Symmetry: D2
Subunit: 254 residues, 4 copies
Amino acid sequence: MDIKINDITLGNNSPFVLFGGINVLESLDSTLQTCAHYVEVTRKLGIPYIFKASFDKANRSSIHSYRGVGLEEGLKIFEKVKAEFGIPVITDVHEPHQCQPVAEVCDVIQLPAFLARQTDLVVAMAKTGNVVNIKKPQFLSPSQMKNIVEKFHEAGNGKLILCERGSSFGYDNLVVDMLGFGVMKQTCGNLPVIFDVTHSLARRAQALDLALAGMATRLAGLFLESHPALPLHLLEDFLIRIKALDDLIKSQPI
Amino acid sequence: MDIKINDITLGNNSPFVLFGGINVLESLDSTLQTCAHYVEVTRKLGIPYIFKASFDKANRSSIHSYRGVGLEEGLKIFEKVKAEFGIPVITDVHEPHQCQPVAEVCDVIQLPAFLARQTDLVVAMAKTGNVVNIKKPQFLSPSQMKNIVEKFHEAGNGKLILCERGSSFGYDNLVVDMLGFGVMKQTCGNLPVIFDVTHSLATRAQALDLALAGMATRLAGLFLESLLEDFLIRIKALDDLIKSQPILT
Amino acid sequence: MDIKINDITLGNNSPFVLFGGINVLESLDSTLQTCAHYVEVTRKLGIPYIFKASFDKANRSSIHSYRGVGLEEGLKIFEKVKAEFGIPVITDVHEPHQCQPVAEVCDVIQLPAFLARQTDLVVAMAKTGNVVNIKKPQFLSPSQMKNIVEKFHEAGNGKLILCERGSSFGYDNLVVDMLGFGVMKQTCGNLPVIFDVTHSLAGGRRAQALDLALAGMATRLAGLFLELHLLEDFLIRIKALDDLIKSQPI
Amino acid sequence: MDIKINDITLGNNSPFVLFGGINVLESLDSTLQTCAHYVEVTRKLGIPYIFKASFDKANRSSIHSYRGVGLEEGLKIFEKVKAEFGIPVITDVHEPHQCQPVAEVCDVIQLPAFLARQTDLVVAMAKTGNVVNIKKPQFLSPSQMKNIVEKFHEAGNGKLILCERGSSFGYDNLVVDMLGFGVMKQTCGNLPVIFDVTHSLARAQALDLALAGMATRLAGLFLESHALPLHLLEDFLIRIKALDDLIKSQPIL
Ligand SMILES: [Cl-]
Ligand code: NA
């Protein structure tokens, strides 16, 4: 199943879409600067692009830590991103009440991996009618992603993206099961499957190998972060390699 | 560190406390019935007992499964349980704004495993000043619990219980690392540690072995979501034996 | 099913048997020194005891490290151990041809966990007719022990002990699934199940060993396997717990 | 570091080598028929090829299932394969005494994963001076492979290949950590790394797993056929080769 996001066709047999950006919104000028770089690089490479950022870090290690800009100021920044660049954007939501006002602005809304079982958040996200990115919890098997998809379907929203981010492997370590991509395609109606390489890693060399490995299994998209996280100036070289492999894979019959 | 819960002493060197009841609150009559059974078995054996139920469960099997009677009616049901039986009660909260009113009635407030890192909920729970049960997420190692504990301490509350419920083991399955209990005690200042055997088997004779194994490591309590007597006779026997001996010299 | 090893009854509803000794045999004198201690402590606590040691370090740190005394000298020391103390002994075997010569002297022969699927070794060990301790591999479901038991039974040997040593938990780490003891009893005809606390690992580390040992023995097991007065203090508590568990109806 | 195997160059920056054949040597004529098919397909596509089989399967489903033709007859069959097709062959050894007679015939000798820490077998293998394929045990981490490598180096042999076969993941299951290849490359002196996709699967699955692994830049791919169906080999190798050619044609970043 393909999903149209403005002029972008997202699907497992279409050219990969980059969901790219930053950890958290810190200010307007820093955000526009980073986004400008992503847009310019992806445009010349001919890679469809959706800008990603969080307005709030809801689970840092300290209560005093910087959470980022917060919701009200966050949305304002997303409005300016879309107007200047004409691209879609994606952000996560942590509380049911945030969903409709966030969805008015942000094209894709994202279910955090920790909150996948928060049924009210799921229903509140579903009702908005927006495209939803489902972060696959590290403690959930790929065969059970269908259970989350079921809930969104019953709440009336079938515009769902499935986002791999690794699986718990002993204590404090993740492994990405490359068979899980196919299992999700087969059991969830071939909904778009994307790969969050950045959060899978918890590394410029290893991030490239892991991204290539994942995209080799024929995916709708790649999800990642940079900091002015991949180093920002290596994005173009990184992406040339990913596009090379994606173009090759996508040109082979299934 | 011991925690006093009304007339109950909860701690890793004290007789174990049973935490148990029902999944979601339905009605005064249904609650009193299930609670009655727990109370009669525990009183018969002299086991301290804290009744558990959810007034509004956010983590549901399906979208339209009953969430429970809700805040207002739930707290009224809890007040009657306390008045009728003279026991403490425990309930989960998942909304920051609900912590204060729940805390007027519920002796222990429980932080759901999935929300264990939500700073806003932690802070709102901490600010009640109530005893708090922290459920250890299955994706978190026992040495990471001290970070949650630290966030509660920052927010002004040290009356914390740590609750084991298993760790992710490959696909679909949870394993309980019997060594995790000791790591939690050593790293978190010997806070009371309790064992949620029921949700350690999430997604029985089996359960008896697991419960006995956990309690052998010297724990403040046992957490059941629900034979009862035969089970409790066995846990109490092991618990009295273990607690009656001093720690390794 | 109980197994008789001389005057010892080994079984999941009998008093636990301690299997204890040293990693690798170096000298007769240090071997008799260590065994005498175990025998002194277990006797005064009333715990049946089987002395364990390897005649060979199969995996060495270096290709230049000392291997131990080897089979010939190893078996000589085991004979001295048996004559002097009058207890059963247990050792591991790594090659099929070693089985019958080792079995002549050693009461229990042990199948290492990583060799558990080696059919040649299984068959050779089975043909000795000796009591066999099967170490459960660290990747294997407990219900899959059934398949190893089946091979021994097909090779004509039913005197099998099942030994838990932990399961792989990410890289370089082990976890012991306390539910697996029951599964092994239920699926493998209630053969004796014992717990190798020492290898399942990896007041400090001695505290960890006690907690783990107590947790396992709470599930009702035939024995416990190991490698100021620390053994004493440890065994006093295990025996207290074991006596309690074994006095309860199943 | 590259390794020369007759006229084949095996290395993490060379065109991938297929290590392929069958589980157990059961027969002469069948082994040759199967080998003939691998040869025809790999020659058609220009893919370097090493024939694989076990003559003595130590780990078997039942105690009396056929272990294989055994050493003497198995080495005769390997000799016939080399003579007929002019290709190198690979096989595993289980005991030190097998190392010499096997190394005399076979171009690569393989250390089974479950025996990978048997010091006696490692030394005996090293001392043949033969090219050795070291199977990574499922219960071992990638940064521990250097310890097996060091034991071989101490015994005088550096012609080593490292073979990924997956890692234990919960009960009765394997996951392949795609990051392990790089760890093994960096910590073991960039020795050739190959991927045993057959035994990594606890198929469209085999193809996905193989493509993923080969995207990380590897010296080779190790598989068995009947286990993949034998007549679908060409289609499979066409896809592997396409990815490998692309990856290898770009300089490392
Ligand atoms: Cl293995
Ligand atoms: Na050779």
